[PDB]
Structure 1
Amino acid sequence: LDILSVGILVKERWKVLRKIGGGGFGEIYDALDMLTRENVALKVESAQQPKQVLKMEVAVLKKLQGKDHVCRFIGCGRNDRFNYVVMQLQGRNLADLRRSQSRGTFTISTTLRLGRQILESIESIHSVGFLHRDIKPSNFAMGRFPSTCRKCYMLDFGLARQFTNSCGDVRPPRAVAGFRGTVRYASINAHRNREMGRHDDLWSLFYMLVEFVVGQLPWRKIKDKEQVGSIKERYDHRLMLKHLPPEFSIFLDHISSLDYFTKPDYQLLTSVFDNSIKTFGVIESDPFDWEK
């Protein structure tokens, strides 16, 4: 059951206007901020629920404030009935944009530019000590205004985990960690119930980029989590290089070499995007596929 409904006023300030996420998005709304006269996003969870994650989402949103590709933090609260967080409202998500492409694929030019922006947001969340752990196309959205619509934003920190300790060292991994995320984009390490690391967010990015260009992943029709994991464990991921620019062999070899204890060479991964964009003559001003 939903805890709020359209029309509710939160803290005598945010008027809930429209439900924009249910299911795996949780309970999230477009609300009217009466202070600034603008639409914002407002996400709520029951305060009597056993696993409550908004406290951590607020912490991550606050720790990311001032980074590119993150929604501006607007407010939060906690009462006896629910917890909530309020943040900048964005536009259409990438799963929606791809499915609305009718051939269900993006061009290389759109894929490279989105992938570089997503890689930036991933390095950013890691840089504040958190793993996202559910990197997937519906957790990235473009802005909704002329000044933001060419920018891609990272969404939903509900499955995040802090991977650094008080000091800032990598924290010792648990021996077993229950599967986190979405089956389709999860790395083999999530399937093996290992503690996830920075490279596992990058594996999910690699799968997203492949799906952007090809339109599907090899395990698209497989729903059982164990069957999918067995496929990924045996899969020759070099088959996925066929439709990507040549330097993605470097990207795949790099992430394949990483483990929980190895910091990714983000500069190398970035150069894969930069060099590819240059080889294909992609300019930032060029239209994205949905702008055609």
Structure 2
Amino acid sequence: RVGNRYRLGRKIGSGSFGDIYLGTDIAAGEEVAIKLECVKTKHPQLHIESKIYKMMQGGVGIPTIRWCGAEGDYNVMVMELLGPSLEDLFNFCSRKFSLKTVLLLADQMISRIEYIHSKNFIHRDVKPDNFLMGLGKKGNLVYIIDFGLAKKYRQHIPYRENKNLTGTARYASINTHLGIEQSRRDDLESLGYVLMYFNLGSLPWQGLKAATKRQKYERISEKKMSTPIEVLCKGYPSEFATYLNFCRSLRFDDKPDYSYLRQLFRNLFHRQGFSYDYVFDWNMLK
């Protein structure tokens, strides 16, 4: 009923500019994730996003793209099925992750973003929902998904201001709130807020009161810019504050020192005496 060998199932979620459905590859006897886009939509993107996935193929933690085409009223992208998102797993774990789990995640997540940047793209929506654990033998592997908002940043793109927020406000960089064109530094700053989100259970600019929706962004921006990093990270290892400070110090077109940032957390990991066995909090449920 789709691509001759795929059967469409129930709806399991939504991404940028489309919904994700469960499917079965009948010939291979394997489940897949299927993203649908109305063929007649005013701004078609799916075939663009699929070209990005096809170009990222072979990178660690990039989902495999099995088929792309058009059936009936829909453009179709068939992907390997992945496991739960870090947001789902965070909620399943009662919104508290151990330091070991945060550091295991940080190590992989920095690498995913570096890989995307190595392919001349910035993700621009770094958030727990867009990182998924693999299934089965890949269950220790963090995947990144959803390139619907991705953009090619290179010869670097020029410095531009006054550009509406393209991403989630909660994890957006301060530069993004100021209207500055996003670049590599902003993906990493967003990751920094995600890590503090995992440590705290919430960020201090969550749950602010506002009506007309522009007011909400104003208030998030204000709180984010008036919350010093040392206050945000108080009571947690200094490496997280150093990480955020480093990202906030990056120039627009700087190539981030990914190795330095990973080594920050690796050194903390070793000082804690943790083992790199990939045993996350959720793997210890009986």
When normalised by structure 1's length, the TM-score is 0.90
Is 1:48 aligned to 2:40, yes or no?
yes
Matches of residues 24-173 of structure 1 in structure 2 within 5 Å? 26-78=18-70, 81-102=73-94, 104-145=95-136, 147-164=137-154, 169-173=155-159
Q: Deviations over 1:156-207 (max 9, x none)?
A: 111111111xxxx112244432211111111112222221011111111011
* Between 77-86 and 62-71, the greater mean CA deviation after superposition: 77-86
Give the counterpart of 2:179 among 193, 206, 210: 193
Distance 2:49 2:159 in 1: 21
2:76 is paired with a residue whose SS is strand
The number of equivalent residue pairs is: 278
Match of 1:212 in 2: 198
Distance 1:56 1:226 in 2: 32
1:291 is paired with a residue whose SS is helix
Equivalent pair of 1:213/1:243 in contact (CA under 8 Å): no
Structure 1 residues 119 and 286, CA gap change in structure 2 (3 angstroms): closer
Distance 1:260 1:78 in 2: 39
1:183 is paired with a residue whose SS is coil
Offset of residue 75 of structure 1 = 1.5
Q: Deviations over 1:193-250 (max 9, x none)?
A: 2210111111110111001011110011126111101111222112233243233343
Equivalent pair of 1:197/1:259 in contact (CA under 8 Å): no
Is 1:274 aligned to 2:266, yes or no?
yes
Offset of residue 17 of structure 1 = 1.5
Structure 1 residues 154 and 254, CA gap change in structure 2 (3 angstroms): same
Q: Deviations over 1:132-165 (max 9, x none)?
A: 11110011111121x111111101111111111x
Offset of residue 12 of structure 1 = 1.7
Distance 2:2 2:231 in 1: 51
Offset of residue 23 of structure 1 = 7.3
Structure 1 residues 83 and 188, CA gap change in structure 2 (3 angstroms): same
Instruction: Output the amino acid matched with 1:198.
Output: R
* Between 148-157 and 186-195, the greater mean CA deviation after superposition: 186-195
Equivalent pair of 1:60/1:130 in contact (CA under 8 Å): no
When normalised by structure 2's length, the TM-score is 0.92
Distance 1:144 1:135 in 2: 21
Q: Could you list the runs of 5+ residues in structure 2 that have no partner in the other structure? A: 211-215
Structure 1 residues 243 and 117, CA gap change in structure 2 (3 angstroms): farther
Match of 1:203 in 2: 189
Distance 2:151 2:236 in 1: 31
**Identity over aligned pairs, percent:** 37
Distance 1:189 1:276 in 2: 28
Structure 1 residues 16 and 80, CA gap change in structure 2 (3 angstroms): closer
1:69 is paired with a residue whose SS is coil
* Between 54-63 and 247-256, the greater mean CA deviation after superposition: 247-256
